[PDB]
Amino acid sequence: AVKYYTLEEIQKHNNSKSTWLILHHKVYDLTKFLEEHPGGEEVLREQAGGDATENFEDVGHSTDARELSKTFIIGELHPDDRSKIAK
Ligand code: HEM
């Protein structure tokens, strides 16, 4: 069974103590990845707590980066919150 989180829940994880973001409806805990990310901490920091899909896609990310992202998945956006934000 898939763990869901709402937007309101995710929105709280917006700082160094706990940073989550959403990509393509998956929820990622990037708390430790922030200082590993090749693209730096501040671009993650600026989108913390919400959907970052467009920005992730707009800047481009390798296949290797997309495979790496799977390692930080902690759950999925609640179905009733999908109409807000795009997959
Ligand atoms: C869990 C999610 C993420 C993973 C694993 C990840 C991983 C990476 C990796 C491995 C690179 C090096 C280049 C590449 O392989 O394409 C990269 C570069 C970059 N990332 Fe991410 N990234 C993530 C999320 C994001 C997000 C959400 C943003 C923007 C808000 C972002 C912005 C950038 C930028 C600006 C670069 C530099 C592009 C370049 O090399 O020219 N990344 N990322």
Swiss-Prot record:
| One GO CC term on file | intracellular membrane-bounded organelle
Q: Which residues carry this modification: N6-acetyllysine?
A: K3, K12
Q: Does the keyword RNA-binding apply?
A: no
Endoplasmic reticulum keyword on record: yes
Per UniProt, heme binds at: H37, H61
Limits of the Cytochrome b5 heme-binding domain: 2-78
User: Superkingdom of the source?
Assistant: Eukaryota
Entry's Gene Ontology molecular function annotations: heme binding; metal ion binding
**Which UniProt keywords are listed?**
Acetylation, Cytoplasm, Electron transport, Endoplasmic reticulum, Heme, Iron, Membrane, Metal-binding, Microsome, Transmembrane, Transmembrane helix, Transport
Functional note: Cytochrome b5 is a membrane-bound hemoprotein functioning as an electron carrier for several membrane-bound oxygenases.
Similarity-based family = Belongs to the cytochrome b5 family.
Tell me the protein's name. Cytochrome b5
Natural source organism: Sus scrofa
Q: Summarize which stretch of the complete protein this chain spans.
A: 8 to 94 of 134
